[PDB]
Design a protein around this ligand. Structure first.
Ligand SMILES: CC(C)(COP(=O)(O)OP(=O)(O)OC[C@H]1O[C@@H](n2cnc3c(N)ncnc32)[C@H](O)[C@@H]1OP(=O)(O)O)[C@@H](O)C(=O)NCCC(=O)NCCS
Ligand SMILES: CC(C)(COP(=O)(O)OP(=O)(O)OC[C@H]1O[C@@H](n2cnc3c(N)ncnc32)[C@H](O)[C@@H]1OP(=O)(O)O)[C@@H](O)C(=O)NCCC(=O)NCCS
Ligand SMILES: CC(C)(COP(=O)(O)OP(=O)(O)OC[C@H]1O[C@@H](n2cnc3c(N)ncnc32)[C@H](O)[C@@H]1OP(=O)(O)O)[C@@H](O)C(=O)NCCC(=O)NCCS
Lengths: 232, 237, 233
């Protein structure tokens, strides 16, 4: 993290000196701080704010969360390495990637939902669907190192589980058909416009083709595709 | 309705004491009010506003609509009950009212549909655009929807100018009821129909009563009532 | 153009008198201007502004682009004719059509991407994805006479090429599967709603890709691809 943070500063410092119309915002958002945690809260606050919710209130809200849970910072960094490897600049991904931003703002919403602040967690969950166009129910359990390519259009149900190092592309739907939502193994690649329905199990290292409609379980390391989807 | 309105005010009261940050907003929107019609209008006007349209201008507009049409109030309650009785995530009445893109969009549409029949079409499209921006629901003002409609995860939905949606229909996210130029060219949905996520239904075809259309399906033919349509291209089951 | 603008000013002066809820906004946007570029620049600036980017700044940016490049003004009028022909009243298409407004904002980002103002280009690119719900990489080459119908949900890759007179619909994905790796769409093609096209494959002139289709192979001119996976018809 400490080095990753060192990158973003240098990388945001270049974009500042070369593009003056983004200089101010880059300073306040990134260059004026001394920690990724503070710089990520400052951003998420300004992005998710509304009449109902001040920007300052949310800056405070995400800052406490990040400073109260070490796993979150461990995730935010892991989700940032996942992009720079799998996908951009480190700083662009910080300030421009809806998939990254929303994943992080979800963990806070997940936290709030565990700490019995459900009315606020659903409110924050509503902003996320409005701004980042990502629709993950707060109760959903997601891992770290998650990549959301062009996250516009994503829907994750209430009782779904997303393992680590999963790549979920645009327009993916993990929904029902109780515990009625899919469980995604570590290192799964889900294709664009894919819909996976019902409490089923996608195996580790598996891959799901674009436009697929998976109803049945998908064994690890296997590739499933089609409408309906069968094992290749 | 007075029960639903009474249930909303109660749940809102519980949330205002459990979370201070949402207190003031819940008061002004729900608690400080005496009816559902006024609380809905107050809320729509705040989510569908811009520099083009003031929040206060819209407040009056929806408020004049609901007060000049009993059917509009009936549709909102019927829609409220249908998210409590039907929705997977099992929402309380207040959370559907405030946080649900679908239900909220549907009530903004009914007014837009009203400004179209009342020959205020340049306004009916201005308000149609806002609904698309904010709620991510693209229904033409000339489209006919019933009441008791469900809209899970609203974002993505598109409904055509000539389409017809009956009562108690469940439309899921990313569904398209669109064409295949002039005339009846969009689908007619019967009552009780469930339309799966992502599914696209094209043309002046009729999805009969109680039928079901699975996710990611591409329906191009008529679907006989009380049956199930599925696949690309969709087949009857 | 000199007429299509004359027709916009006509339709706009009409709605301005038939709905005073929009009267000041129409005057400010359209009727107080003497060019299509200025009104388009004005509008696109208010539609895309945020805390990062002032509306009066983006109004300066769009104005200086259309004024520097005559092929922008043409591509705008082309896109306008296309929607009027294929889909609006001209005024309505100018002010409320997400697909149109996206295109004309994208080309400006594309210019910045060539003129090496790539941080600004991607900034402007990221607003266009918010406001207009169209995700086109500034690197993507698009022609003119382009129609995005209910433009929500469109994703266009970095090495995609979209030819003249193409109709791209609801929920289309022109994506991948470094280097050239995205679709190349010929002139006159109609892409269906929900369709996903993947790879450095070519869609020939005047072809047709059905709705919800998944395209992985090339598609020969003047033929129709359909289904999942897509078969020629
Ligand atoms: C399926 C995928 C994951 C590749 O995995 P894979 O193991 O290499 O799959 P294969 O290349 O072996 O597929 C070969 C067979 O599966 C079929 N197939 C492959 N991808 C398919 C798809 N997306 N939809 C339907 N069928 C598909 C092929 O038609 C072929 O069928 P065949 O056996 O009858 O000849 C990949 O092709 C894909 O779908 N990626 C989506 C990524 C995306 O959408 N990116 C958008 C970026 S903007
Ligand atoms: C289609 C649906 C309505 C089921 O209706 P149904 O009458 O019970 O049909 P069944 O579940 O009994 O399955 C019947 C057949 O159709 C097939 N089938 C069902 N749903 C399918 C789908 N979405 N795609 C492709 N094939 C499907 C089944 O494989 C089965 O095949 P078979 O004849 O070889 O056995 C349901 O599967 C569905 O798709 N719901 C939408 C899910 C959704 O949108 N969730 C989001 C909530 S967050
Ligand atoms: C493919 C399309 C362009 C029609 O073009 P076309 O050249 O006339 O193709 P046809 O109508 O002759 O199709 C006939 C056959 O292709 C099949 N077919 C056509 N369109 C299909 C589609 N979108 N999906 C699956 N199958 C399709 C038909 O079932 C039919 O089957 P058959 O081979 O057994 O006879 C049209 O169907 C389409 O996909 N339009 C999308 C536009 C849209 O989605 N608009 C939304 C507006 S809001």
């Amino acid at each position: 993290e400490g080095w990753v943070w060192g990158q973003i500063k240098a990388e945001a410092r270049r974009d500042a000196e070369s593009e003056p119309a983004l200089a101010s915002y880059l300073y306040s958002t990134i260059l004026s701080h001394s920690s990724l945690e503070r710089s990520l809260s400052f951003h998420l606050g300004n992005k998710l704010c509304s009449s109902t919710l001040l920007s300052t209130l949310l800056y405070d809200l995400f800052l406490n969360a990040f400073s109260s849970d070490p796993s979150l910072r461990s995730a935010a960094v892991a989700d940032l390495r996942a992009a720079r490897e799998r996908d951009v600049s480190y700083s662009h991904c910080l300030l421009n990637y809806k998939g990254f931003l929303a994943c992080q703002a979800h963990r806070v919403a997940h936290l709030l939902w565990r700490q019995s602040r459900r009315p606020l967690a659903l409110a924050l969950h509503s902003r996320i669907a409005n701004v980042f166009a990502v629709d993950i129910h707060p109760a959903a359990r997601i891992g770290k190192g998650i990549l959301f390519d062009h996250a516009t259009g994503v829907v994750v149900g209430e009782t779904a589980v997303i393992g680590n190092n999963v790549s979920i592309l645009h327009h993916v739907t993990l929904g029902g058909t109780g515990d009625r939502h899919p469980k995604i193994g570590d290192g799964v690649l889900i294709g664009a416009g894919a819909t996976i329905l019902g409490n089923i199990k996608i195996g580790e290292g598996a891959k799901v083709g674009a436009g697929s409609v998976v109803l049945i379980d998908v064994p690890p390391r296997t590739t499933a595709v089609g409408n309906p989807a069968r094992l290749v």
